[PDB]
Amino acid sequence: MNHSCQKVFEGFVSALYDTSYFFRNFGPFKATIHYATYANYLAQNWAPRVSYIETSTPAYTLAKNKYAVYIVYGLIGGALIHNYMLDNKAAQKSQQYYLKHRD
């Protein structure tokens, strides 16, 4: 490119590089990035799960790790069914209340 535009472009890219480097390596910003990276890693690679590799002999595996799936299913299904029953009960209660109040 034209050498004047070359000077402008070199200056601009140098400014961009310096800004990025400063923002990343500044003390507080560096600490924030460093902690957030590990938090993101924990969230992504250690999220709650129901399937995992079993490397232990049956004698060396807890019962929790053989019935965790069933406990989770019980909890979720019970929550859904109980919410459904609560919805029905609230429907009946509201209907009865507003009926006895008028018409």
Binding site: M1, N2, C5, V8, F9, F12
Partner: protein, 218 residues
């Protein structure tokens, strides 16, 4: 209903009431076809089975219901003139910017996006980038502008609010025109006694409060 296009109002005595009726009848057939299509879609979807239908009919077919309400209100209004939009600008300064994104009034060009694209083009021209890069950087801001412009169903809610306001205003205006001759004499007497332009309802509410406060119960 297949309403005729020829209004039965007298233009000489109720001009605005005649124009409103004429526009309503003119656009009624088209808006009725759209409303029928929407209702047919809704009921046929509700006839579905399990996930394809009933199990999720009322809650997930929301855009269709919103379109149906907008179509019904617009059919009742018929046509909208800029004077009313500017009138409602009091409570919603972006009424035109919202009423453009709800109705197919005029074609919208992403002018801000194209301007940003031209700026990026100037930048690339200065820094001697390949033409493919600058064409892509022209498309990209345009794409962003289009994405942020279209859709925007909140503008439809604001259009519904404005159309309700406009319908109430037009009804009241028609009532004003219909009884204008009857109130000519009373109006002439009133203007000479009250120098205020404030409404009769507001003044009477203030008078009622004044009586309730100061007047001796006796």
């Amino acid at each position: 209903v297949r309403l005729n296009l020829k209004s039965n109002v007298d233009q000489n005595e109720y001009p605005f009431l005649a124009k409103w009726d004429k526009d309503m009848r003119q656009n009624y057939e088209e808006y009725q076809n759209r409303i029928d299509a929407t209702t047919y879609h809704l009921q046929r979807s509700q006839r579905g089975i399990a996930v394809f239908g009933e199990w999720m009919y009322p809650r997930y077919f929301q855009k269709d219901i919103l379109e149906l309400e907008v179509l019904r209100r617009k059919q009742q209004l018929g046509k909208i003139y800029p004077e009313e939009v500017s009138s409602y600008t009091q409570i919603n300064p972006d009424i035109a910017n919202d009423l453009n994104l709800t109705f197919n009034a005029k074609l919208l060009w992403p002018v801000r996006g194209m301007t940003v694209g031209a700026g990026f083009f100037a930048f690339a021209h200065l820094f001697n980038l390949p033409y493919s890069f600058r064409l892509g950087l022209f498309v990209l801001p345009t794409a962003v502008e289009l994405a942020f412009t279209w859709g925007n169903k909140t503008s439809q809610f604001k259009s519904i609010e404005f159309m309700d306001y406009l319908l109430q205003y037009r009804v009241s205006k028609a009532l004003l025109e219909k009884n204008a001759k009857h109130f000519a004499e009373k109006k002439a007497a009133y203007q000479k006694e009250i120098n205020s332009s404030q409404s009769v309802q507001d003044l009477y509410n203030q008078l009622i409060t004044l009586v309730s406060e100061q007047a001796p119960s006796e």
